Amino acid sequence: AANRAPTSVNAQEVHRWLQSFNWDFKNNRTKYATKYKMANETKEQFKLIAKEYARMEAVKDERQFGSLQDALTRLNAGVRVHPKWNETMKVVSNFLEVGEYNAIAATGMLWDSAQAAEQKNGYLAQVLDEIRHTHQCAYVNYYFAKNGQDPAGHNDARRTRTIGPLWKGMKRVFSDGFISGDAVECSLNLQLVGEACFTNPLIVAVTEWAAANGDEITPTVFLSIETDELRHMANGYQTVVSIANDPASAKYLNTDLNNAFWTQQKYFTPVLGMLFEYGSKFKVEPWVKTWNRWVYEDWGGIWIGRLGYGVESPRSLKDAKQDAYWAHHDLYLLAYALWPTGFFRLALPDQEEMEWFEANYPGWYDHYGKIYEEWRARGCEDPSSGFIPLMWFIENNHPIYIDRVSQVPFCPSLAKGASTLRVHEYNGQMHTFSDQWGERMWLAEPERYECQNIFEQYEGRELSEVIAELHGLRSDGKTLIAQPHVRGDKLWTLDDIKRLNCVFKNPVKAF
Amino acid sequence: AANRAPTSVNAQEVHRWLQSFNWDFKNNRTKYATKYKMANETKEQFKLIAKEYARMEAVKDERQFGSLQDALTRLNAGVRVHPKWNETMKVVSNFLEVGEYNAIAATGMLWDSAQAAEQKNGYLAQVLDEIRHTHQCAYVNYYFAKNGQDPAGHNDARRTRTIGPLWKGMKRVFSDGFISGDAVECSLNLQLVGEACFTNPLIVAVTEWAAANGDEITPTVFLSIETDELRHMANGYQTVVSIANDPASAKYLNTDLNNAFWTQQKYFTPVLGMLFEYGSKFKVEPWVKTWNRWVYEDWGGIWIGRLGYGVESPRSLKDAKQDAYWAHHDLYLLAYALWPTGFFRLALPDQEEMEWFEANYPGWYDHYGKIYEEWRARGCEDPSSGFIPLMWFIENNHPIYIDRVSQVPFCPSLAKGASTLRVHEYNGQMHTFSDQWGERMWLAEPERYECQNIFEQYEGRELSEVIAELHGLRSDGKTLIAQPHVRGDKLWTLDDIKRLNCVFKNPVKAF
Amino acid sequence: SVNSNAYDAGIMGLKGKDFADQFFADENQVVHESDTVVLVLKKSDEINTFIEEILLTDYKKNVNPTVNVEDRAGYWWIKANGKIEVDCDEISELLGRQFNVYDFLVDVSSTIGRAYTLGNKFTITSELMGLD
Amino acid sequence: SVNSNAYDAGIMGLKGKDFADQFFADENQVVHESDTVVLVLKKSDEINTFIEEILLTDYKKNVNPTVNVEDRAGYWWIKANGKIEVDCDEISELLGRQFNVYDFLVDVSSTIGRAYTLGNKFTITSELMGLD
Amino acid sequence: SMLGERRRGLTDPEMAAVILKALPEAPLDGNNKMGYFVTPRWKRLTEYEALTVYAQPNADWIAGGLDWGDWTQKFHGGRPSWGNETTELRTVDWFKHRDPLRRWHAPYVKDKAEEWRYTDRFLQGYSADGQIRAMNPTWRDEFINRYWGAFLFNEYGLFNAHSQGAREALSDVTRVSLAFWGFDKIDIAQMIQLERGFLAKIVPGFDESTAVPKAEWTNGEVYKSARLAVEGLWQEVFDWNESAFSVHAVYDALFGQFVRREFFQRLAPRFGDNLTPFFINQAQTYFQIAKQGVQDLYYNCLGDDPEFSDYNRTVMRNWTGKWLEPTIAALRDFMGLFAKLPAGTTDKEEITASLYRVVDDWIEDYASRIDFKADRDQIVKAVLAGLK
Amino acid sequence: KAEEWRYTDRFLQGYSADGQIRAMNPTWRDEFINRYWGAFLFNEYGLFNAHSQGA
Amino acid sequence: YKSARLAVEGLWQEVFDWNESAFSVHAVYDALFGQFVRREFFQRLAPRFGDNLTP
Amino acid sequence: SMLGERRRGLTDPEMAAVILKALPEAPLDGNNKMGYFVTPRWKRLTEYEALTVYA
Amino acid sequence: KLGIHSNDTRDAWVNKIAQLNTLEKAAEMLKQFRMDHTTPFRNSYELDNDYLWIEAKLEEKVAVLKARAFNEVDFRHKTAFGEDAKSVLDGTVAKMNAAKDKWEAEKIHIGFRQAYKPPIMPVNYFLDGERQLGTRLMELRNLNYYDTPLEELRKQRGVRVVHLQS
Ligand SMILES: [Fe+3]
Ligand SMILES: [Fe+3]
Ligand SMILES: [Fe+3]
Ligand SMILES: [Fe+3]
């Protein structure tokens, strides 16, 4: 007819004028506390508009589901996965879910504190992303409950969450450590540290362990989750470059970096390490090597190393590498001991695994291996025994404390990881600590950290009562969601926990 | 604001007035010859509308291409497939492709011969269906060519198929047997026997043998192909009711029915059965059982048996069941004998196979088995031998003929199926037929069956030059696409075919 | 009704000359009328869910006790006596998302019998519609 | 170059005490700068084709000899000295269909380095954007 | 050919054998229902609900919370992560809310993608068809570039007003809703600029620079009270509920509805303009999508709370009344546009009828639901007082 | 086409709830589209069937 | 729509050359008549009656 | 839980091993392009041109 | 009963909040409770397990009473004690920028929260406070963070050192 065929307005022809959408008025300022107040007029690296963002993600979902729904369900990829790993994913998925859910709120602060229009469009797009990843992790549990071998814990993870101390930390690593604090700082705690360092081993490297043990559900979802997390990094980086160019704002960088780095790796390191090695059968490699690749050599190398742009190598790295070698071993002792709390089944390290540990962690058998052997001898896998490893901790004078800061359970009489007990008394309340950094955080700011631990709340309570109040049973009302073994025979009932009489004590009462 | 929120007006609400879209006028009549004059006041059994059609089909494409492009490329499902099946799918997919593609034009006749408006809508939807099915089959070849162990064949089965004898039959069964003839008869040839009897063993049954041999690409595509081939059946069956309700039209039915049945079974039964058993390592069940299931008992009893309407069992049925037992066994001999003509790699039956055939088709070893053994002893696989199983046919006086009608190759001296040589001459040309029905078809309609045969076209030609002209070679321009062994070493070359100097001769010339 | 509509009822389950005899002579050279129905459903999340929690449960017990489904490669071979009906608003409720017959028609691979949709209610039957 | 960019480049590939002895002392308790880059490509049909037919054959051979591709379970781990730039119009041409950067980011699973787009070109570099 | 270096527990024989040997004969719980405990809004639990409800780790001291204990880390000063003190509205349960359209992320982006691609095919068709020839040049050069392009900032400011809400929202459902609402708004703004860019493409001389409509927004007589309202709703409210409510249940429902529906989509048809109503359709569709969620949240859950009904209603009249005046001022100020219209484009009678449409709609859908005694005649009158 | 079909759905559901029908001329409605636009339907329908032979 | 119906009846049922049908439909009849009815009548006058549905 | 009664050459260890052992070292042909001989209207072949031409 | 979401502590405080029928008795009880059980500066830790829930169940009373007793302008601009929120806000921020160290700052901020936490002060003014207040407290705290030895830091906090493993 009249002229040719242009729709010649792509996303990038509209995005060219997106920066001008913002006008100068008076109260055009952030509604949040922040000490970072340099000019932050940065450009969004992936020049997205709303509809083109939606299209891209729609393509991801398009291929993602259907693989789930058509082929993987045909291949029965939800059953031909493998029990320990089936139980492991309840924790991995649900905890990622809440971490990525808090990322939405953290982005809310990043969005609100943004000064460029491109980034406000970008950060709301990121909000949508973290909402997606939420629904994605939500979908993994959904699928594994619907098609898997043990749906219990996959189906009610969000309330059976509440019985165990590992959950308490998860509400701090990639969550309260993000949203509860400085707003512009979220460029560091959420993005320079969280999404630039720990998302990789936790979302990418887990898929390997998944695929090694028959899970092809997790790779399809998680490897699509991370696809979004790379644009996040680049936009956070731009806020970082703004900070480091203002002498009045760069001064806050190193401490906040270090405070963030420790905050996350304090829980990240022992919990993901123990989920990989103790929650699987086929190992991909030692967790330290995963930790040394992603965290130390690549993240630290290409990010922290490159910045120097006076940015310092974290002070707590020395302790972290040590935690990277031992913390995950220290923690499974606790987790397996406190097995009647979780929403998942746990298993003892078999013979081939003990050899694997000893071969890659020299000293493992003499310390950990013998303990598991004793526990096995006492009948921890047998409901007719009347034994839980917690009893062994008490018999042998081995107290278990919860860090007031990180919420990570620890046992200073057994720990080979970089943890050291500290007990204080303030205003008629005693506070326990497992490192110098956490104790420094509470010493300076004791009003941020008032989180009641499982011992303070369950003090004077009988174990089975707590498990039953929080619906830790299965559909019969008899059987527990948690088990000390992974077989489907001779499962522990409620009356088997009530058979023994484990009443909780607040360990600090000993002082 | 306004009132409620209807987008209301879904499919079945516009469809209510579809039948009123046609208006009476003089030339409102078919452009194709037809002896069926009755009225097609037929309602499309699926109240389809163009946009809901596209929607439903888009959803299928979403999951299908998702699984293909995402998860199955991650499981390497294009490689982890038994080499025999990798070769078989070159024929199956490409032959089905042309079958479906011809079904487009066949439906174009049904669309033109239709009187109801709802069916003119439905038959353009059916036309579109066979267009999807065309692109789907092509895609299986496309995928296996780009991601498989031997793209040769898959990458040119539209010009290398022109060398073979099996391709000629294919251009009739689900091709010219549909589009060449009566338009209102395609309700019987294309639909009542094509889509309602044979697309189940040809699309649904194949998926089982595909999964048995490590292929999860074909089930993903093919099971999604057949999903449409039921709206076809119903919308064809509706025309059948029209015909059976008209005494002047019901007089042609049984003849057209039986003729279509035999026309199709003549090539479908042997070619597909031999494709299953001699093209797979892992067998699902004997072909006679697959055949007895879908054809004789199911389609026979469910459609044809129930119609007695006043419909009869096919007269050729007893001959058809005989072809079910031996014809496919008869055809692999010939097919293997003429292996350089193909575009795919064939293989001798190994020991288990050798005794699986005897276990299920007793009398097999004394007939087919010892021929295969002799052939291996002659060196049918070794490029140094100078042997091709066609020579054994000559030496032992077993002439190979091609039907003038069905185009199916047959050797009557050896045949255990229902093949019986009949030779006629008429105006200076001789004609070979293998059955009562086919030769009657020619005797009544010699102007329809003029298809030249392999020995006619290549008369006096040296096999190497035939192969070389039709591009039956690989990237090197030396090694043949087809091989007498499914292995990967010591492959035949042009020279290996030129060396033994095989010149084609018209068998009919020998009278 | 469930082993009678089995994929391997007589003369299947016979092999060798046990098969050939009853296959080649002589009442079996003629087609035998069947009151049954064949449904082929593609192996996916929705189909498995409808089969496991609707087809085998309330339908097989309250409506059609003759529905026999068998596992194959990537599909379900279903066979019943007379007919099979699929209420897709029932499925929609079970999935927790919008689902009509056309959403359901994504994974119904094949049919032996007459199929049709009455709104959002898919039914396949052995009755000859229009001449019975 | 290519092998210093391997996943298991030393000290990875040391076992037991030989690994601990290097992981626990002593100049390795502080962070070391790296001019490299990490690119995680999610495994798919489009991406495998790209790696096999553009990355390893054209880019590696003609622009960046140091790019190392390792096979993990569900993804490709890629590392290189300097940067990696992907013109997506070449991927579009090679896929035989329309394809922009946002189609490419569908299977770009992760990055270690500062990544960005400019037109339809995808860049991931070691260079600190805005400080250098 | 090449199978690769790595192995899988699914394909690899040895590993699979180990895994298959370890498998049970049946599931260890007969309950394949995720969120089986979640009380469903409708008859049976939906995917929307199952994948969304209780995703926020709230404790029982926040209505509907299931966890216990205090937040693990808090702000400097002691301010909690999520708390009851971030809003004036109060509930029995914060997880009661449902998007009646049941949007979670996947269907949301699917729908928008469709709209995006069809927009592309449309613009290609409209340009190739040459329908630009049938549009009045004055309406295009001035009324589309300057006055329609200035509404961009209204939708932009309205989108940024959701920023704090994305951080302070007190449940998963509301958070999901809010984000979608604000995201629809920024989409509409960009789609306005999309149209200016397109016009700049097929009409030579047309400048797509935002300079002109920006100057009409920043230093304008028509949108001055509008911008004042936007600046206020955006950057002077700290109650995330007050923000969302006042923007959707008061300001956009009156001013936004009038500008889009009763001006630009009522008047563009009369200048040969099928271009901008194409996008306004997306806009209105978006509005009526959001409206449904806004209604379920504030009226069905909050104002119909069997415990905090009269409290919420009182506070929502407060906000309704607090923000009703900058909106009427915004409307009265917008009326100075009908005087730059070419003669006989529309009359006082039509303008009045359109005002009553917006107002009667706002009464039926919003004000009445919380028992706000609004007087349509005084509102329409207050706005018409600036009809030049 | 599926994209078009669903956005059409969303559009109508929005138009009908947004009450844009009120501003529309009643004469142009029950006369100029109900009768004269609804008759171009058959024009396109015949134009559709003029492809049955080319397939 | 008399001459229009006549032209349609012709194009549809009185042409056996598939190329003639398709060409004459899209390159002659629709490109003139159809384009006028759709663009230069309805989607040009409809907006003048408060109709955004038909466009 | 329950893994049916039918086995696959992709999953089942017994069959998969058989298939694996039977595989070649490399593809028997490096020409992985379906429709490589098909003329391309533009510089490069497309799926449209591949899945359609010469069917 | 002695549970987590259900004990006798909560019942008693439910049956104790169900008598406060006046805003002044409600607002002070809330303010007092917040001085008793809320911070690290609290007067007791005996309700540590149940204080957040009961604070909320007292907030609900104060809010419903404040809205039922106030007009539209007062509810929007005034505390439950009758004070100009804008004045309390302006003053507290003035007091905060006059603070000399991290110690003076935290007492100001915490005190502001213990006293003027909603439904006492309107939400908008409060979070505007949190904005400026939290800004200053952070500015003063995170300077030379690691320069004060943990030994000296425990002194300044005024803690009673109970145990120190090495
Ligand atoms: Fe995320
Ligand atoms: Fe992120
Ligand atoms: Fe077909
Ligand atoms: Fe078909």
JSON list of C-alpha atoms and ligand atoms in Angstrom, two decimals, chain B residues 96 99-101 103 126 129-131 133-134 195 199 203 225-226 228-229 232, ligand 3:
[
{"chain": "B", "resi": 96, "resn": "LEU", "atom": "CA", "xyz": [5.29, -40.76, 7.20]},
{"chain": "B", "resi": 99, "resn": "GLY", "atom": "CA", "xyz": [2.05, -39.78, 3.84]},
{"chain": "B", "resi": 100, "resn": "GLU", "atom": "CA", "xyz": [0.89, -36.82, 5.90]},
{"chain": "B", "resi": 101, "resn": "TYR", "atom": "CA", "xyz": [1.85, -34.33, 3.19]},
{"chain": "B", "resi": 103, "resn": "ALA", "atom": "CA", "xyz": [-3.04, -36.15, 3.30]},
{"chain": "B", "resi": 126, "resn": "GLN", "atom": "CA", "xyz": [-7.50, -30.84, 9.02]},
{"chain": "B", "resi": 129, "resn": "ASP", "atom": "CA", "xyz": [-3.09, -30.54, 10.75]},
{"chain": "B", "resi": 130, "resn": "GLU", "atom": "CA", "xyz": [-1.39, -32.51, 7.99]},
{"chain": "B", "resi": 131, "resn": "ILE", "atom": "CA", "xyz": [0.81, -29.45, 7.42]},
{"chain": "B", "resi": 133, "resn": "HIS", "atom": "CA", "xyz": [2.41, -33.34, 10.68]},
{"chain": "B", "resi": 134, "resn": "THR", "atom": "CA", "xyz": [4.50, -32.66, 7.60]},
{"chain": "B", "resi": 195, "resn": "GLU", "atom": "CA", "xyz": [-6.38, -42.42, 9.64]},
{"chain": "B", "resi": 199, "resn": "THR", "atom": "CA", "xyz": [-1.92, -44.33, 11.73]},
{"chain": "B", "resi": 203, "resn": "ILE", "atom": "CA", "xyz": [2.54, -43.48, 14.61]},
{"chain": "B", "resi": 225, "resn": "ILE", "atom": "CA", "xyz": [1.25, -35.91, 15.69]},
{"chain": "B", "resi": 226, "resn": "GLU", "atom": "CA", "xyz": [-1.50, -38.47, 16.22]},
{"chain": "B", "resi": 228, "resn": "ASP", "atom": "CA", "xyz": [-5.02, -34.48, 15.75]},
{"chain": "B", "resi": 229, "resn": "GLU", "atom": "CA", "xyz": [-5.74, -37.66, 13.79]},
{"chain": "B", "resi": 232, "resn": "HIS", "atom": "CA", "xyz": [-10.08, -36.42, 11.31]},
{"chain": "J", "resi": 3, "resn": "FE", "atom": "FE", "xyz": [-1.65, -36.26, 9.70]}
]
